[PDB]
């Protein structure tokens, strides 16, 4: 091994063992649970509650909310519709 060695190609060995548009991921995404960036799922299922809530990088934006002009309640984005109706 040598860091300075010019790379010929991919090992045939390895090829023998393996093998458009971003909008076309939608089918798959529809059938795929919520994914995290840096929280491995097998580690989650192993070391954390089966029903744990997880907010990844929780301090990397404020909680997005708006305040009802009628009663002043701070409402999360996904609760606003309901709180109007």
């Amino acid at each position: 091994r040598s860091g300075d060695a010019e790379i010929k190609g991919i090992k045939p060995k390895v090829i023998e063992e393996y093998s458009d548009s971003w909008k076309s991921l939608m089918s798959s995404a529809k059938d795929t649970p919520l994914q995290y960036d840096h929280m491995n799922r097998e580690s989650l299922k192993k070391y954390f509650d089966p029903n744990a809530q997880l907010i990844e990088d929780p301090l990397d934006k404020p909680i997005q909310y708006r305040v009802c002009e009628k009663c002043g309640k701070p409402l999360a984005l996904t609760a606003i519709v309901d709180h109007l109706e």
């Binding site: 860091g3 010019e6 790379i7 010929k8 190609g9 991919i10 390895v14 393996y18």
Partner: protein
Amino acid sequence: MTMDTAQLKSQIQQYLVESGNYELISNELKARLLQEGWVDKVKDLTKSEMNINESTNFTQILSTVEPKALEMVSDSTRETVLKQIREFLEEIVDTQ
């Protein structure tokens, strides 16, 4: 017959990804950067550069943050992740 080096660089990255090893490398790296205070240093450095330049323009601000953010990575993290990446590359490629 010469092979297209650019495309080859793309296959290599792709094989890294299909093994799962790109995730490992990337996860190792972030855990190290988090633990050594680097992510926070970058966030501070960014705030300091917005204030100094009285600007929130992403392109302008990055222009002065990134080089410094690059130098701030400890040599330990750098060395360690580079070795990990080298060892995985030796599983994938042929050299000459």
